[PDB]
Each structure stands twice: as C-alpha cells, then as structure tokens.
Design a protein around this ligand. Sequence first.
Ligand SMILES: CC(=O)c1ccc(OCCN2CC3(COC3)C2)c(NC(=O)c2cc(NC(=O)c3ccco3)cc(-c3ccn(C)n3)c2)c1
Length: 116
Amino acid sequence: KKIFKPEELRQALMPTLEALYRQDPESLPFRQPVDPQLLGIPDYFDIVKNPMDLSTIKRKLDTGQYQEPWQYVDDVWLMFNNAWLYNRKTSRVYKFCSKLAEVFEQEIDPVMQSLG
Ligand SMILES: CC(=O)c1ccc(OCCN2CC3(COC3)C2)c(NC(=O)c2cc(NC(=O)c3ccco3)cc(-c3ccn(C)n3)c2)c1
C-alpha cells in the first residue's frame, strides 16, 4: 500500500534516465522518437506498435505519469525491446541498445532497493 509522490519518483529515477542520455554515441538513436520517414525506415510502424524513447519517458517523469517505479522501468524496457525487435542483431542500433541496457541495469538496481 506504499504511495510514491511525483517528486519522490522524479528525484530517485531521473538520474537513471540521465545516465542513459550521457551515453554518447549509444543514446543518440534514442533521444527523440523514431521518425520512420526522416530515418528512411518507412516500415517501422508496421513492426513497432508502441514506440518509446528517452524524451517521452522524460516527459512522463516530469508530468507525474508514473505512480510506481516499475511503470518507469517498464517504459525503459519497452524502448529496449522495440530496438531489439526492429533492428538486426548486427546493426548499430541493436548494439547501442544492448549497451544502454547494461548501463541501465547497473544504475537502476541500487535505486529499486532503496525505493521499495
Ligand atoms: C530506435 C530505432 O529502432 C532506430 C532504428 C534506426 C535508426 O536509424 C536508421 C539509420 N540511420 C541512422 C543513421 C546513422 O547516421 C544516421 C543511419 C535509428 N536512429 C539512429 O540510428 C540515429 C543515429 C544517430 N547517430 C549515431 O548513432 C552516431 C554514432 C556516431 C556518431 O553518430 C543519430 C540519430 C538522430 C536522429 C535525430 N537526431 C538529432 N539524431 C539517429 C533508430
């Protein structure tokens, strides 16, 4: 029955998002929503039905749309799963995604233990 205030969640969780943003070049494919037309991948929305990216997740943190830490974590892993799904295993974005996933697991595990 534990209650999380929006600012309590933002303060605990926003550093883990900032850690993803700090990965350069690995975060560059993920800082804005995929634009299938600009990127030259017009089939993207045929395959990815629930797009997610760092900027969307940041706006949900900034607007209190997460009531529970796991809802935040779900959006981060939705972003990873999208990239692993759409992109080939040998591709730039897949490998960049795998790097972000490792960085995220490191940053989030101590925060989940302290939150709860
Ligand atoms: C999320 C997902 O499933 C997905 C699929 C395919 C994608 O792309 C298709 C390929 N095209 C990207 C290129 C390579 O160059 C453009 C070929 C992307 N998107 C990127 O891969 C990307 C990469 C950089 N850049 C560096 O990865 C990099 C490494 C070293 C130097 O720069 C930037 C950006 C970007 C978009 C807007 N902005 C301001 N920036 C996007 C994302």
